[PDB]
Amino acid sequence: RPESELIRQSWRVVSRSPLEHGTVLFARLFALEPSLLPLFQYNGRQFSSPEDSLSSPEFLDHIRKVMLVIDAAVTNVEDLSSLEEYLTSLGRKHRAVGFRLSSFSTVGESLLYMLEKSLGPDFTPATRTAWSRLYGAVVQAMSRGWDG
Numbered sequence: 001r002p003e004s005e006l007i008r009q010s011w012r013v014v015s016r017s018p019l020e021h022g023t024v025l026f027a028r029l030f031a032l033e034p035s036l037l038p039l040f041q042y043n044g045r046q047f048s049s050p051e052d053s054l055s056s057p058e059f060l061d062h063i064r065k066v067m068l069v070i071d072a073a074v075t076n077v078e079d080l081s082s083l084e085e086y087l088t089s090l091g092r093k094h095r096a097v098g099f100r101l102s103s104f105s106t107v108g109e110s111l112l113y114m115l116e117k118s119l120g121p122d123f124t125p126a127t128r129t130a131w132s133r134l135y136g137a138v139v140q141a142m143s144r145g146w147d148g
């Protein structure tokens, strides 16, 4: 498929520096939906400001984890049913920490923002479309952790 290669070639650019790009994703995320900030509860404390999250080593590890799951999705872009059972339980885990299904779209928008900023003119509307579909497939799998 032409979509698969668009994903692989765009990801190649981002996967070079995953924390720097991930940090973009999350900064954007908290700008769009500040109420996601309290869900990160390392040492039973809440971040006061988005910038506090950026000084937490656990938070930065979580960014790395995010980027690793996306990398796995990219690698399996030709068949994402292989990740399905993992993504479902990943969904369940996030449901447990207090993530809401409706916040998936914010994460998606954040992902697209990060790609748009990173690729600039290379972020064509076909790249956009490809990534939306990839992201959608991921969310559909994770969503089964709410079962339904």
Ligand code: HEM
Binding pocket: 029, 036, 039, 040, 041, 058, 061, 062, 065, 066, 069, 070, 090, 093, 094, 097, 099, 107
């Ligand atoms: C954007 C909102 C999200 C929030 C608020 C959030 C929050 C959390 C929290 C609180 C944990 C548990 C503590 C920790 O491991 O750092 C966690 C774990 C995790 N998150 Fe997220 N997360 C989000 C999104 C994502 C997304 C989109 C992915 C992947 C695509 C991701 C991948 C992971 C992974 C792999 C773990 C470790 C799960 C385990 O095996 O226990 N997270 N997340």
